[PDB]
């Protein structure tokens with residue numbers, strides 16, 4: 145047996161764009177992502193799969209059924225987001241005291257009069273519907289983390305096709321400080337409207353992926369898919385100060401904890417000669433971002449500066465974790481290696497003989513212990529594991545994947561790390577971005593024709609864990625690597 149603290153909660157995470165649409169009247173055509181996946185040129189290039197989010201699992205209409213299953217499953221925590229585009233589908237008036245030419249947004253004044261003006265422009269049907277969803281959620285005794293942002297922006301803030309084409313005259317997303325200003329107002333506004341229902345807040349989900357895939361990893365088919373080291377830095381600079389202003393905005397309205405959710409890889413040495421390459425990978429991929437929003441340390445242009453407006457803007461850390469990255473020391477610096485981590489073949493084995501998911505991701509649960517303990521020792525801010533899961537429609541590996549990673553969180557707590565819950569990605573299958581519906585991460589299988597939900601055997605395993613607040617003796621064998629012999633190589 146591995147028992148968790150009495151206050152620890154097992155649950156799930158979900159995104160609006162990925163799960164909401166599918167039922168009559170649920171369509172949200174008004175995001176950069178929606179336009180991006182419907183684009184004929186993007187479809188012909190194979191940048192996006194051709195699957196359309198409006199054919200998705202239908203959480204907007206069917207939320208009481210998702211919640212029914214989560215409750216059957218004994219889940220006690222949920223993290224999801226409000227879709228910005230649903231609240232403000234049309235543009236807001238240009239802000240006052242806003243100089244679009246300044247690099248830094250060090251303050252965004254929001255007062256109650258401003259919020260009531262904001263309220264005039266908000267979609268009321270959507271606001272009421274989200275209230276109905278979150279209320280039903282709370283009525284199941286689910287603790288509620290509200291995330292403000294999980295990738296799609298209102299189209300009036302970002303036209304990604306225009307940007308893909310190299311035209312920077314239109315709405316340019318995280319490349320514009322207007323988006324930073326509006327994000328702060330949006331987040332404060334949502335905290336003002338929902339604080340009675342929320343337990344903890346997150347400002348954003350995985351900002352590094354937004355800037356990294358949007359402007360460098362352009363083969364991934366993430367908007368705007370404009371290849372530029374320089375614009376990726378600008379995007380990341382803007383998203384950081386956006387988080388800080390959102391933190392201040394929410395705090396102006398709420399006393400509740402405000403954190404952030406970030407995408408993590410466990411950086412692993414190829415040989416015992418690559419321990420320094422690991423540290424460098426960790427600097428370049430993790431610490432630089434958290435040192436910015438915790439310690440105010442940031443690079444602006446060429447200068448390494450400290451900004452007092454950034455410092456201390458974090459109460460907790462959402463650890464998203466799927467797999468490792470293997471690195472090796474180089475002449476220049478270091479490189480990530482193909483054949484490990486998320487750079488493997490689908491439904492195969494990594495170069496280390498570890499099985500890979502439907503997405504080509506390597507089974508590596510100890511990475512989670514690595515990540516959780518490293519964050520803890522560096523900052524001493526409590527954590528939630530806000531995502532962890534596997535693309536596995538067959539459910540071959542998920543039972544092992546689940547029990548193994550949950551064991552690693554136990555290990556982390558045992559070492560003294562303050563980790564307060566584990567949130568599987570996800571309750572049910574959903575729209576996996578540029579990959580479409582074929583990447584199935586659900587504990588529950590979705591029939592996309594009928595919108596019926598099915599319990600994969602792993603959902604039954606998760607019920608055993610959640611209802612007992614422990615990995616029980618009877619399932620402890622699943623704290624192991626899925627046997628590789630019977631699987632594809």
Ligand SMILES: OC[C@@H]1[C@@H](O)[C@H](O)[C@@H](O)c2[nH]cc[n+]21
Pocket residue numbers: 159162349350407464466531569576585
């Ligand atoms: O790919 C599975 C999931 C996505 O569906 C989520 O939207 C995103 O938060 C994320 N980051 C890493 C892995 N995942």
